[PDB]
Design a protein around this ligand. Structure first.
Ligand SMILES: Nc1ncnc2c1ncn2[C@@H]1O[C@H](CSCC[C@H](N)C(=O)O)[C@@H](O)[C@H]1O
Length: 229
C-alpha cells in the first residue's frame, strides 16, 4: 500500500540518462547472475533472452558472447547508445513500424536488438517469444500500479517452457518511496504464482554507500527463478 500511488513518467527516466543519474548501473555486472550463470545455461544452446527495462546492462553481452540472442527494451536512446559505445559494438537502426517515431537498434553482430520504446508498447509488436528473461531494476522500476500489466506483458513474451530470472530489493518502503520500488514475496506470488513455480535462490546484503541517499539503512537483494508449473 505505501508506494502504491507513485507514478513516474518516461520523460523523468530519460532525464536521468541525460543528467548522468544512473547509479543503478553495475559496471562489473550482476554478481548473483555471475554466480548462477552456468547452472542457468547448462545444456542450453542458442536461447532467446529478453531484458526488460535494460538500460545499458552489461549482462546482455554475457549472453550474446555465449551464443544466445538478446533483445532488450529501453525508453532512453542515450542509454542504448551508451551500451553500444561501452561494449564497443557497431549497430544500425530500423523503425518499429507499429509504434511511429520509435526505433530498434541492432548490433552489427546480429545478436543484440534494443527496442527504444516503452515496455508497454511491446504487445503491439512482433517481438515474439523468449526462452529466458533477465529482470533486474525492471519489475522494481515499474510504477507500482503498472505491475499487473507488466506481469501480463511478460507472460505474453514467454515460451511454453522458460526460465524467468528475477531480482527484487527488500527494504522498508516507508523510508524510501522508490524507485526502485519494494516488491515483497507476496507481490511476486500475486503476479506470477498462478503460472509459475517460484524458487528464491539467494538473499544477500546489497547495501552500498550510495543507498544512504534513500534514507534506508538495510538493503537485501533476492534472486528468484520462475519456471513453468
Ligand atoms: N516503461 C518503460 N519502458 C522502457 N524503459 C523504461 C520504462 N520505464 C523506465 N524505463 C527504463 O528502465 C530502466 C530502469 S533502471 C535499471 C536498468 C538496467 N535493467 C540495469 O540493470 O542496470 C531505466 O534505464 C529507464 O530509462
Amino acid at each position: 500500500e505505501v508506494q502504491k500511488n507513485q507514478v513516474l513518467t518516461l520523460e523523468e527516466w530519460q532525464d536521468k540518462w541525460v543528467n548522468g543519474k544512473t547509479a543503478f548501473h553495475q559496471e562489473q555486472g550482476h554478481q548473483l547472475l555471475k554466480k548462477h550463470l552456468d547452472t542457468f545455461l547448462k545444456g542450453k544452446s542458442g536461447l532467446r533472452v529478453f531484458f526488460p527495462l535494460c538500460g545499458k546492462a552489461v549482462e546482455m553481452k554475457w549472453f550474446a558472447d555465449r551464443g544466445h540472442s538478446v533483445v532488450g527494451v529501453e525508453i532512453s536512446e542515450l542509454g542504448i547508445q551508451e551500451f553500444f559505445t561501452e561494449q564497443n559494438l557497431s549497430y544500425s537502426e530500423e523503425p518499429i513500424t507499429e509504434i511511429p517515431g520509435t526505433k530498434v537498434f541492432k548490433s552489427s553482430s546480429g545478436n543484440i536488438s534494443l527496442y527504444c520504446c516503452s515496455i508497454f508498447d511491446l504487445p503491439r509488436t512482433n517481438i515474439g517469444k523468449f526462452d529466458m528473461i533477465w529482470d533486474r531494476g525492471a519489475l522494481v522500476a515499474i510504477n507500482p500500479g503498472d505491475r499487473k500489466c507488466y506481469a501480463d506483458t511478460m507472460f505474453s513474451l514467454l515460451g511454453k517452457k522458460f526460465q524467468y530470472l528475477l531480482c527484487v530489493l527488500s527494504y522498508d518502503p516507508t523510508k524510501h518511496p522508490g524507485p526502485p520500488f519494494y516488491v515483497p514475496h507476496a507481490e511476486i506470488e500475486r503476479l506470477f504464482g498462478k503460472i509459475c513455480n517460484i524458487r528464491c535462490l539467494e538473499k544477500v546484503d546489497a547495501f552500498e554507500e550510495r543507498h544512504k541517499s534513500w534514507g534506508i539503512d538495510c538493503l537485501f537483494e533476492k534472486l528468484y527463478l520462475l519456471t513453468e508449473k
